């Protein structure tokens, strides 16, 4: 809504390293950001582009999950929600869900039902304390879907790292339940957690994301890929992320 709503301009006070991942991006346009806990350092491809703010789309379901956990809308014994019988074009949505199935299959209605229960002032207080992008709730509806709420690729990393790693008002059991819902891959070398996001405008992919973290035996890394052009899907942002993480030594 304002002059600072499309841009993150706050100086990075940390050590940073500029990357060149242009061959992995190919004909897609966007940015990649990673933070290493042990190094306390950022690694950024396309720094200017990493500070442009975009709708988070389904990546904001990380925060809706944390809010629903925090407000006891869902819990550890029961995160189940029945389907309202409305037919969706993907059968994974046309059934009962829990936090794990809804996160994995990005089931909008589950997180919409969570959001509808959450008072605007709580969200405002949370987005302020978390420093979540432009903090702009607009109409307070599906505000995170190609709407007023926007966040930069650089901020996706800072905000998620700070939420998970600081002793804040979110409980340890909530953070662990959210993590369990985000786990994608675990082997002898790493655990990989994350969440895709895709914005679709007039039939075309507009906006792709993959935001997450990696735990190895040595370090913990938070990362985010944003795609703004080319074939900017969540699936593509996930693939590009995996290729970059592997090149960097994060996945072994
Ligand atoms: C999130 O980015 C979108 C959006 C509607 O907010 C939804 C659609 C999908 S993918 C799930 C497809 N069907 C599965 N059974 C995503 C996405 O994460 O990219 N989320």
């Amino acid at each position: 809504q304002s002059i600072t709503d499309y841009n993150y301009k706050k100086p990075l006070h940390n050590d940073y390293q500029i990357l060149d991942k242009s061959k992995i991006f190919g004909s897609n346009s966007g940015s990649f950001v990673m933070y290493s806990m042990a190094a306390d350092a950022y690694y950024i491809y396309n720094e200017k582009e990493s500070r442009k703010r975009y709708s988070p789309n389904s990546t904001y379901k990380i925060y809706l999950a944390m809010f629903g956990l925090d407000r006891h809308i869902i819990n550890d014994e029961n995160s189940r929600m029945s389907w309202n019988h409305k037919h969706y074009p993907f059968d994974a949505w046309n059934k009962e869900q829990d936090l794990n199935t809804a996160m994995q299959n990005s089931v909008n209605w589950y997180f919409e039902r969570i959001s509808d229960q959450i008072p605007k002032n709580y969200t405002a207080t949370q987005l302020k304390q978390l420093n979540y992008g432009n903090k702009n709730l607009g109409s307070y509806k599906s505000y995170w879907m190609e709407d007023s709420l926007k966040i930069s690729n650089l901020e996706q990393v800072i905000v998620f790292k700070n939420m998970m790693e600081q002793n804040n008002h979110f409980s340890k059991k909530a953070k662990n339940q959210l993590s369990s819902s985000l786990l994608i891959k675990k082997n002898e070398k790493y655990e990989l957690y994350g969440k895709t996001g895709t914005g679709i405008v007039n039939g075309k992919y507009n906006n792709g994301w993959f935001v997450g973290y990696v735990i190895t035996n040595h370090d913990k890394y938070y990362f985010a890929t944003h795609l703004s052009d080319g074939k900017p899907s969540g699936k593509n942002a996930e693939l590009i992320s995996e290729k970059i993480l592997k090149e960097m030594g994060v996945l072994n």
Side-chain angles (χ1 to χ4, degrees), residues 171-229:
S171 70
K172 183 38 70 163
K173 107 205 180 222
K175 289 179 198 198
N176 287 337
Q177 184 164 7
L178 166 71
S179 289
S180 295
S181 81
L182 299 174
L183 185 73
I184 292 160
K185 197 141 161 56
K186 170 174 176 72
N187 65 359
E188 283 213 317
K189 308 305 164 202
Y190 65 91
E191 296 181 340
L192 182 262
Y193 300 78
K195 179 72 189 94
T196 53
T198 318
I200 295 164
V201 172
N202 215 54
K204 309 288 184 78
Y205 298 131
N206 191 45
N207 214 304
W209 287 107
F210 185 58
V211 169
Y213 61 95
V214 176
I215 302 172
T216 74
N217 290 324
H218 299 318
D219 199 355
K220 182 171 199 190
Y221 307 84
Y222 289 77
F223 64 86
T225 295
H226 179 263
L227 301 180
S228 67
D229 195 24

Side-chain angles (χ1 to χ4, degrees), residues 57-58 61 90 92-93 105-106 108 144-145 195-199 234:
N57 295 305
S58 299
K61 292 160 172 187
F90 324 111
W93 290 29
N105 300 305
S106 212
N108 288 354
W144 66 96
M145 302 174 48
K195 179 72 189 94
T196 53
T198 318

Side-chain angles (χ1 to χ4, degrees), residues 12 14-17 34-43 222:
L12 212 47
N14 303 249
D15 288 317
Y16 57 89
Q17 161 158 330
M34 186 179 78
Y35 175 74
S36 158
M37 296 286 295
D40 184 28
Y42 291 89
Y43 303 84
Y222 289 77

